[PDB]
Symmetry: D2
């Protein structure tokens, strides 16, 4: 509805962090100092779906070698969600598929979908705290064993 | 502990049934008439495990082209569990892996692990209602999405 | 977004059905003949939430002793979801709480939240297939045991 | 089958720990020094069951104001399971009901089922690492909402 960074954690730029893929990939930061990492709300996502973000107005996006118009939001492992920019919506959809599909940020499949540190460029900040559209899609989900012959059901895509 | 057929559903022999793979595969029957299919207790199995059965004394087993010493028990779709013999423990373990792993009796992978109808042979019955050992093993299990960033965890094998 | 009855299942009126509380309570019907019961889409609802419906324009509602402006949608047990009107939003919220909380349409707590058959009145139909707002709320949810010491977490309200 | 403390964590006595109810309740310790707390294996428990422990030979039990013949094993919050003695099997069953039912060691209901620190008495150690019987029982379990109209089922007691 009105998806943006938690209040105060904007403007932000895409930079690097030793606690996100050992400083090798871009993540949104609200400052240049120790652990000034932008924090993001948890999107309500039901089993059988995914979500990623696409900024409503690209002119308001943070800028590296390009405007960062698409991203995936995921737990950092440090008690809040981080925003991970991607090159485009296709990559964002593929990263969300991996993570909502059961994957981890430390998986090679995830790492290869991040934007590398050498794309930071000028590290320009966003225009304020702009609104992103929550992009939702069905996600193919397998049966999961619970107990005896009880399973939670598959969801086709 | 004392695994055997539900009381009354023994002696049984391995025969065929139009409601189990269209009469093409062996399933334990307690009679030759309409839907006289042996019924079996539900083994208590936690998420992350499987179970199959291996008869304690092979001399007591039902006999087709061989003594039926190993089987997998699974819901029939008709309100009770059926007993599906296999050629050996390896096949039983592979069928249990498939089913407790989320598969279905109508899957080609499952069908290829059943014993074909042409192995019915004399269709000799078991010696009474003999005891089977419950064979338990860990089963590799993937993360399963529940809601938002919540997953039920993987279990290694 | 555009919640309404599945196409063709409108206009509808609130009447009775032998397969919903033995004809004692109102349910939306698209005709007077055998099992002409209106069918409704499944709302996407994540664990930890509920949903009920409130018609956007009351003038378009089906009419009994009052305009039926609020309802809960739930599986009928016959392969589709039925629409169950309530007297007001408070009752609808209480019925959704009961059902998304794990209850059943045959529970006394649910039955007492239905509208009784004697409120059918003229049984006037809706104006076409009008749009309802999907009313969402958090729903207090308890921990649920999965295996060993693993639980899916509580969600506060 | 052969339930006992992890190797090396025996003999043990029932003493106190600042990280278990602020030193107010008994927990098995394998030494008197910093965090020398006995560690215990995870019992395989499926959804819909509980487990607690009853020592096979009481003469081998640790001794306070009484032989500690019954206990519940639960995660400590510090990366291993602790063993919590109870006065008798009834209390152990009630504590296991609470915890496998979704409760926490910090709940007042749990705290009131622990043995108080003033029952430590001589703090005598067990005879080696004795075997406990794993006592299993069904545990009444409620439906749990997963997504949309999907629930994992109740299990009666």
């Amino acid at each position: 509805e009105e998806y943006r960074a938690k209040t105060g954690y904007a403007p932000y730029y895409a930079g690097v962090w030793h606690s996100f893929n050992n400083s090798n990939s871009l993540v949104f930061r609200w400052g240049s100092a120790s652990d000034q990492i932008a924090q993001w709300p948890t999107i309500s996502v039901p089993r059988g779906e995914l979500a990623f973000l696409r900024i409503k107005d690209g002119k308001q996006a943070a800028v590296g070698t390009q405007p960062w118009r698409t991203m995936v939001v995921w737990p950092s492992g440090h008690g809040y969600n981080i925003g991970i920019p991607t090159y485009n919506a296709e990559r964002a959809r593929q990263l969300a598929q991996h993570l909502y599909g059961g994957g981890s940020l430390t998986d090679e499949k995830a790492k290869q979908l991040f934007v590398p540190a050498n794309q930071q460029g000028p590290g320009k900040v966003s225009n304020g705290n702009p609104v992103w559209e929550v992009m939702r899609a069905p996600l193919a989900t397998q049966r999961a064993h619970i107990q005896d012959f009880e399973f939670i059901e598959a969801i086709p895509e």
